[PDB]
Structure 1
Amino acid sequence: NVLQIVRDHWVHILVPVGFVFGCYLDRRSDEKLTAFRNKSLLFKRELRPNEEVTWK
């Protein structure tokens, strides 16, 4: 009866998918604002070995 269950209760996937999409879009926005990733006068450090970004 799985077809019946999914056919009439698929709406429960929209909102959790919405949360995942929100996380993805927020990470994309974070990508956009990477100008001063490590160029501050406070948290500016030399990249530790095997690191390319401080994710800031």
Structure 2
Amino acid sequence: NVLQIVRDHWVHILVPVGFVFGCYLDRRSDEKLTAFRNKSLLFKRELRPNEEVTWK
């Protein structure tokens, strides 16, 4: 019976999916501005024995 329910209320996932897509695109934008990661004079720091990057 879920066919009619889906074809009537499938418009309710467009906005949440857009929210997740926007979060993913914000992360993709963030990954292109790492030219000074762990390089500022105020926050320059030695890496921990395991971690690879100070922030993502």
TM-score of the two chains, using structure 2 as the length reference:
0.93
C-alpha distance after superposition, 1:27-49 (max 9, x if no partner): 00000001101000011101111
What is the total number of aligned residue pairs between the two structures?
56
Secondary structure of the structure 1 residue equivalent to 2:52: coil
Two-structure CA RMSD over aligned residues (Å): 1.0
Query: How far apart are the structure 2 equivalents of 1:22 and 1:47?
Result: 31
- Indicate the residue corresponding to 1:10 in structure 2: 10
The unaligned stretches of length 5 or more in structure 2 are none
The unaligned stretches of length 5 or more in structure 1 are none
C-alpha distance after superposition, 1:1-56 (max 9, x if no partner): 21110011100000000000000000000000011010000111011111110116
**What percentage of aligned pairs have identical amino acids?**
100
- Structure 1 runs of 4+ with >4 Å offset: none
